[PDB]
Amino acid sequence: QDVDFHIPLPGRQSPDHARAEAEQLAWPRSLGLIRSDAAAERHLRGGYADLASRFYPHATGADLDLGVDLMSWFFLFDDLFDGPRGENPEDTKQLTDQVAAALDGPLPDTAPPIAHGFADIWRRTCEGMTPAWCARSARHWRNYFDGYVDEAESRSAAQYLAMRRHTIGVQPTVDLAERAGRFEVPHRVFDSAVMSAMLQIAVDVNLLLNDIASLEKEEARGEQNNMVMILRREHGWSKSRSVSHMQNEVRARLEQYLLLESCLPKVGEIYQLDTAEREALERYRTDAVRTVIRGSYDWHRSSG
């Protein structure tokens, strides 16, 4: 909670958010993901419908619900690896595969509820979008899953960031902004060195914000796979020099984000984007990439 940062983007949040936070439970309940009332309340206090409403400021009604549900599923799924299952590449994969199976076709009734939940989400993420968009999203989900498997394997900052960039969930998050918004950035521009650089900054910034906010919690339990802990190790720094340096890393990433944003008009020329395309890319910049950057910061300033 509350550490100062340099984030020059407009804070926004969906006008339909309250109604969204109110009906939050019907979904995870009906899919067996939350059984008892104390678990429901343990959920309400993570504040996932709030975060959804900042990542997806442009959404409403069922489109906002799909985001709320993604946010819920995200944390529910993450819990299942807090156990012993998290240090054995084979129990992780064991699970992973049953969830990732949903990307290829229908699931056997005997699949865990965390996998039927995911399928309900994906069935809704893709309906109405184009086949190619759909396939690009699926590719992203599979690395997410493999991210968890390559993490269980582990029993260096550049090595830490390396594995963390997949497990964080940013990309499939951003992908959902397109679906909720009902638009799609030009596929050829999505693959561009400039945009993927903007995407790598959204990811990096998110895990640095995240690692700072939860500093006192993972510390009390001995975890050494946290940016702060790792930064004192590699460099031999005091816990306060490790935190300032991260604020710096963020500040510098945000500076550059803006630099890249200015190269965007020229990038649209290079790809000879037409009028509609030039616009879908504008939406993507302001409604998907920006919101994932700012939404998280605004959120860590009250909830979760």
Catalytic residue status for 37? no
Resolution, Å (one decimal): 2.6
Longest dimension (CA), the chain: 55
Q: Which tokens hold the place of 67?
A: 């985001």
* Rounded CA separation 30/129 (Å): 26
Q: First and final CA of the chain: distance in angstroms?
A: 9
Q: Which of 123, 217, 239, 241 is catalytic?
A: 217
Catalytic residue status for 42? no
What residues are designated binding site for Mg(2+)? Answer: 78, 82, 210, 214, 218
Q: Which tokens hold the place of 33?
A: 């993901």
- Which parts of the chain fold into alpha helices (H)? 17-22, 26-30, 37-44, 48-55, 62-79, 89-100, 113-126, 131-152, 157-167, 170-181, 187-190, 193-213, 215-220, 227-235, 239-262, 264-270, 275-283, 290-299
Tokens 């009390």 belong to 220
Catalytic residue status for 300? yes
Helix H, strand E, coil C: the string for 16-74 is CHHHHHHCCCHHHHHCCCCCCHHHHHHHHCCCHHHHHHHHCCCCCCHHHHHHHHHHHHH
Q: Which tokens hold the place of 282?
A: 């504008």
Between CA 167 and CA 175, with CA 169 as vertex, the angle to 5 degrees is 145
Q: Does the domain at residues 1-304 carry the CATH identifier 2.30.30.140?
A: no
Residues in contact with 26: Cβ distance below 8 Å, sequence separation at least 6, in sequence order:
none
Catalytic residue status for 136? no
Catalytic residue status for 210? yes
Instruction: Compute CA distances 30 → 125, 144, 202, 212, 259, whole Å.
Output: 19, 25, 33, 34, 46
Sorted by where each begins, the domain ranges of the chain are 1-304
Residue 143 in 3-state DSSP? helix
* Rounded CA separation 63/179 (Å): 8
Tokens 């290079």 belong to 270
Catalytic residue status for 179? no
**126 contacts 134 by C-beta, under 8 angstroms:** yes
Q: Which of 164, 179, 290, 294 is catalytic?
A: 164
Tokens 């996998």 belong to 115
**119 contacts 56 by C-beta, under 8 angstroms:** no
Which letter does DSSP use for residue 109 in this model?
T
